[PDB]
Amino acid sequence: MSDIGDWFRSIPAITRYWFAATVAVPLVGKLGLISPAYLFLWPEAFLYRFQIWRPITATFYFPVGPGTGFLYLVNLYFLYQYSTRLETGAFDGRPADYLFMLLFNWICIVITGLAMDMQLLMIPLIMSVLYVWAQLNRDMIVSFWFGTRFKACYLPWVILGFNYIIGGSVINELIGNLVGHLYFFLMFRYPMDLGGRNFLSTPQFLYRWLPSRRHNWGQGFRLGD
Amino acid sequence: MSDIGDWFRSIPAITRYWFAATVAVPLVGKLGLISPAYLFLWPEAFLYRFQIWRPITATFYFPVGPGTGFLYLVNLYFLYQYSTRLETGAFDGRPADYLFMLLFNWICIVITGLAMDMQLLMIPLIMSVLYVWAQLNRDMIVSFWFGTRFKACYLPWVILGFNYIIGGSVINELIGNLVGHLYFFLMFRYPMDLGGRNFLSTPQFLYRWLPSRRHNWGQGFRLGD
Amino acid sequence: RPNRLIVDEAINEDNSVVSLSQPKMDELQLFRGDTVLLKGKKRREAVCIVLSDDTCSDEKIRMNRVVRNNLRVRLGDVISIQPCPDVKYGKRIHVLPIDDTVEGITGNLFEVYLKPYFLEAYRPIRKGDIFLVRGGMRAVEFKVVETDPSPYCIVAPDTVIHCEGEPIKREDEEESLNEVGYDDIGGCRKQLAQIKEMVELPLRHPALFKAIGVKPPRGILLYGPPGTGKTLIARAVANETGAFFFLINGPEIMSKLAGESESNLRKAFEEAEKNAPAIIFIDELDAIAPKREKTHGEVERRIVSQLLTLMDGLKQRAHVIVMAATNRPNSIDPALRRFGRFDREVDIGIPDATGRLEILQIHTKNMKLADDVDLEQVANETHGHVGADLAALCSEAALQAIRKKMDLIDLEDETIDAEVMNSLAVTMDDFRWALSQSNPSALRETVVEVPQVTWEDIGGLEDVKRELQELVQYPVEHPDKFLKFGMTPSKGVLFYGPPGCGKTLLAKAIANECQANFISIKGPELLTMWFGESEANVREIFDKARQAAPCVLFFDELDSIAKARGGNIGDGGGAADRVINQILTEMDGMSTKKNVFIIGATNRPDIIDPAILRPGRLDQLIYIPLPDEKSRVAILKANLRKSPVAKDVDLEFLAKMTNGFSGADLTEICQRACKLAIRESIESEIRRERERQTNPSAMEVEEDDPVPEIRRDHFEEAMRFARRSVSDNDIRKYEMFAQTLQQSR
Ligand SMILES: Nc1ncnc2c1ncn2[C@@H]1O[C@H](COP(=O)(O)OP(=O)(O)OP(=O)(O)O)[C@@H](O)[C@H]1O
Numbered sequence A, B: 001m002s003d004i005g006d007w008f009r010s011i012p013a014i015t016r017y018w019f020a021a022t023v024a025v026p027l028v029g030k031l032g033l034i035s036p037a038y039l040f041l042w043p044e045a046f047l048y049r050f051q052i053w054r055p056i057t058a059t060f061y062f063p064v065g066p067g068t069g070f071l072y073l074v075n076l077y078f079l080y081q082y083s084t085r086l087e088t089g090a091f092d093g094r095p096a097d098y099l100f101m102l103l104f105n106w107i108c109i110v111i112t113g114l115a116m117d118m119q120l121l122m123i124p125l126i127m128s129v130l131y132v133w134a135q136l137n138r139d140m141i142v143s144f145w146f147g148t149r150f151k152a153c154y155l156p157w158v159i160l161g162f163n164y165i166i167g168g169s170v171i172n173e174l175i176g177n178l179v180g181h182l183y184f185f186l187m188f189r190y191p192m193d194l195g196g197r198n199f200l201s202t203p204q205f206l207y208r209w210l211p212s213r214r215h216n217w218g219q220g221f222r223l224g225d
Numbered sequence C: 001r002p003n004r005l006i007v008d009e010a011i012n013e014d015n016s017v018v019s020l021s022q023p024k025m026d027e028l029q030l031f032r033g034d035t036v037l038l039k040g041k042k043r044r045e046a047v048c049i050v051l052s053d054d055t056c057s058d059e060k061i062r063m064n065r066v067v068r069n070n071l072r073v074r075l076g077d078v079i080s081i082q083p084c085p086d087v088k089y090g091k092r093i094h095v096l097p098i099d100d101t102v103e104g105i106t107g108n109l110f111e112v113y114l115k116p117y118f119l120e121a122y123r124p125i126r127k128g129d130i131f132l133v134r135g136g137m138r139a140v141e142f143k144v145v146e147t148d149p150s151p152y153c154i155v156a157p158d159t160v161i162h163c164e165g166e167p168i169k170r171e172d173e174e175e176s177l178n179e180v181g182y183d184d185i186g187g188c189r190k191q192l193a194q195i196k197e198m199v200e201l202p203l204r205h206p207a208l209f210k211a212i213g214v215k216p217p218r219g220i221l222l223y224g225p226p227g228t229g230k231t232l233i234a235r236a237v238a239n240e241t242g243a244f245f246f247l248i249n250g251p252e253i254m255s256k257l258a259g260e261s262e263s264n265l266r267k268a269f270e271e272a273e274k275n276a277p278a279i280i281f282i283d284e285l286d287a288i289a290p291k292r293e294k295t296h297g298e299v300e301r302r303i304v305s306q307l308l309t310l311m312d313g314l315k316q317r318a319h320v321i322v323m324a325a326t327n328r329p330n331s332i333d334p335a336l337r338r339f340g341r342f343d344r345e346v347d348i349g350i351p352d353a354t355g356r357l358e359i360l361q362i363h364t365k366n367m368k369l370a371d372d373v374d375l376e377q378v379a380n381e382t383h384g385h386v387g388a389d390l391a392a393l394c395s396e397a398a399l400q401a402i403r404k405k406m407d408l409i410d411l412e413d414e415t416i417d418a419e420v421m422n423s424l425a426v427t428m429d430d431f432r433w434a435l436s437q438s439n440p441s442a443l444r445e446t447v448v449e450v451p452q453v454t455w456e457d458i459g460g461l462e463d464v465k466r467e468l469q470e471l472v473q474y475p476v477e478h479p480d481k482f483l484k485f486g487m488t489p490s491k492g493v494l495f496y497g498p499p500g501c502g503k504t505l506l507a508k509a510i511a512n513e514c515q516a517n518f519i520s521i522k523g524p525e526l527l528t529m530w531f532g533e534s535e536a537n538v539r540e541i542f543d544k545a546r547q548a549a550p551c552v553l554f555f556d557e558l559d560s561i562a563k564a565r566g567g568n569i570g571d572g573g574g575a576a577d578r579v580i581n582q583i584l585t586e587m588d589g590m591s592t593k594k595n596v597f598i599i600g601a602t603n604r605p606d607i608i609d610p611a612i613l614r615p616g617r618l619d620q621l622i623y624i625p626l627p628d629e630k631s632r633v634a635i636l637k638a639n640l641r642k643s644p645v646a647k648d649v650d651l652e653f654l655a656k657m658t659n660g661f662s663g664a665d666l667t668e669i670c671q672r673a674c675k676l677a678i679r680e681s682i683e684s685e686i687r688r689e690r691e692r693q694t695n696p697s698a699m700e701v702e703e704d705d706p707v708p709e710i711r712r713d714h715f716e717e718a719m720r721f722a723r724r725s726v727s728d729n730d731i732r733k734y735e736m737f738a739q740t741l742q743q744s745r
């Protein structure tokens, strides 16, 4: 028996999917059976050439190494400590819509990654969605075991500064913060400012494989008299 | 003043002598009977010519001197400590199975040594025996003086991290995990998982060396009337 | 399910028997001595001896401490029973003792311990069991390590007992029998019952009680004289129920260092938060929490404030109960008396002779007493002592007995022998000597009890006895009739008459009949309390009396209040006014709910202040008439029993010449005659010791003490010095007062 199995089953569905992806990335990269020619994150292919061959490999193939181990560890502690609050952001219902604008966040951040030439689009998306959830109810502080009264809503910025001073590769998280602010403004402006036949209809195929769940009436009882 | 002498002189004779031989083998290796440069297990040389003088010579010895004695001494300390701990239960009257498990671990590790090109097969033995120990009694709660989440089947990734920061050749702890889990499966899970016909068959000479003992009745006195 | 029984204590002291109600044997088809398998916590199974005991209810199973430990279950738990008479006699069994009791014994356990304990006792035993065997000095324990037949077997004469081997190390799960249980406490049955009542739910079923949603009690104050086992009681309760008992001492904390001591307290509390329903015990509060008047420094104020804040914030939290040990609630700061704080109050009184007897029985369990020990006599002679006193007495009595045999015991140079130890016996002379080299500590302390004087001890006054019974027993016997009639019973009864009539004896007799506590207050104590300490002492006296309800309070030498007030001194007016005002202001505050009665007695009714003679206050007045003839004969007979007896001169005749004599005078005459009889006995022994000097060892026949034959010579001596203690002028004054009251009212 393995307590790891039910521990991971205890993880809520969104963090379940993200953890599955982020643990499959290193294993898939280190498998070595599959030809890496499909997966190199080659800048020349993705930037100038059309190269429909590798339009999505950026988030899957990733050179894992001792480049962000300490930051990844502190984020692992953060998720282990607060995934409950992480998963409960205003989307227990309509979770298909939640995944919808998370995919929209992915497409906007990869647009940024095409326009700009940063290093890793892994932290910025998750930190941006977590911090936008926080900002919708901003400014209640929190601290860890030894944190006496240290203020919250600085942790993204504390990490940014720590990476900026010692080490490197901090620009992508701050550009993700910028695009997240853009997304925060857009989720309020775009749907009501302009129409355009509400863009396009959201596909029901995702509902076909992974439907959303709504109210259930169960069964009633005759009151009688 | 030398409380080391007092602590050593309180050790049970059987475990003191077995552990003394276990730690004296590295002393013989350190003396210089065979140069450490002559312990590499060349694959092709072992394949074609005999070279049977150094398949296990480097396994039971570790190049420890007055530069890294701390790790070696603590490893042997916990080796003896866990030896006694496993002597407490189960192997209180059945040393044959204990020695069978030790030789099983050695056979597995030496099979892996013959198969692949690893060099220092001392720490790999540590992972083998430590994991088989920790998994023979999985699902239990224990804590040291400052135990935070000290729990079964969790020390393997702890030593994963500690060897990643300090050391290398990750395959050793993988093989220790594999052997520990295989033994654990053979203990409880296998009999009702894959039919029957358990493979716990001790060879005759191995049982002849160290057979399981039996409790003596001792002298008795009739109650009478 | 007709197999679940709630565990209960077994009156039987055997370690392999169980007591059941008769329908249990009727339904389960159980014979006497049947081996029945039991089930419980930790999946522990064993067998015992089935014994009939109708005392326990059908659901109640009587079963002792050792088997409770063997089953790893606590009191109040339900067990499962199943018959299994298929046991077989044991043939060869290897047993061993646990290591941490054998230290320094050097003896053969088989003959010294195992042979007498297991003498064909037919004890059903199992492999891996634990049991205890009493010894002359220790209480050793053994474990069955190997059995044949397995696992169950029966003690049989053919039992090859392998008793020698390596001592067994502790099983690392404790469950030691060295703990303290309810059986280890004597003379506190009422208080123990009260605590066991109001501790049960918060500790046994925290989930159920929490789901109910009722605030449990949180503050309990055990107070009494030091060295009475209060800490012992708390530890025993904690061990019995099972908790995370944590102990805190006063001096060890208050004089810790600087000002960080508070953290330790905080530390203690937070540990309870991590450790389930737990008991927090703190000792010697007055040493750290006195009144603010005594507080001279500042740090103590900070300590008290911090502890108050800590304990008041204990609302909800967990099911943690806190109690404190102290001596006098007066010394405690009143601020720690509000609701939510310590409100439950329990006092531990000084045990009587009987309680001393049970304490001695407990402490002498291991000792090999010789056939000369009268524990009851020692308990009678040891009034004014405490549990620690008796423990020390037993310890040094055993020490004296051993030291008397230093020659017998090989002094040698290692662990002593066990057989020599087993050969030692304790003599009553050792106990007498221990008494000689002893002193109690309580001594000058008020004792509250039910007196022993019965009705027949005093003759005459049949109408007086009937009136007292009517005034006292029936109103508490039949409150319903008073409720129907809408009546309040009287409480203040006063006695007036010639001194020396045993009015105190009457009070003791009526208190004994009512079977309630008795409290005695003397005029000496009152006059001592005159100057200065009067108000608080009276208040605490009445508080104690209310605490021990139902009870009878007595007052003596009341007229002495006026004696220093109006008389040759005339200077104690302020103290007398203070005392009288305190008494009046406090006694009327008594409520009819309390079943406490007040009795006053005096021999100078004229000088009594009229304010007391008020309804609600002392109103019932009973004269004390002198015994007459047959009454005098009855009193003489009552005083005559004692030990000597001699019917050679007409006692009624001597009563008839002694007409108009007080009862105390008659008792004095009886004691004078007894002294003359002792003089005659001294004459006898003196002539013995003189005339066997003349004839060397002139004791061939047994010359016993003279049989009680008190001759008319002694009574003629008594009448030669005959004192009419009652004075006729005072008798006339008493009659004048009685007739004045009769005509006026
Ligand atoms: N009811 C009792 N039953 C048996 N032994 C008792 C009893 N009361 C007192 N003793 C004996 O007297 C001793 C007095 O108790 P002890 O000194 O251990 O604690 P305490 O009276 O609660 O107070 P403190 O902790 O201040 O000493 C006990 O240890 C025990 O030997």
Ligand SMILES: Nc1ncnc2c1ncn2[C@@H]1O[C@H](COP(=O)(O)OP(=O)(O)O)[C@@H](O)[C@H]1O
Residues within 6 Å of the ligand: C457, C458, C459, C497, C498, C499, C500, C501, C502, C503, C504, C505, C601, C603, C635, C638, C663, C664, C665, C667, C668
């Ligand atoms: N059965 C009895 N009847 C009358 N007097 C008794 C009896 N037994 C003892 N006494 C005497 O009564 C005396 C105590 O009386 P006490 O209560 O002091 O009366 P008072 O308080 O009026 O002086 C004792 O000295 C004793 O000699």
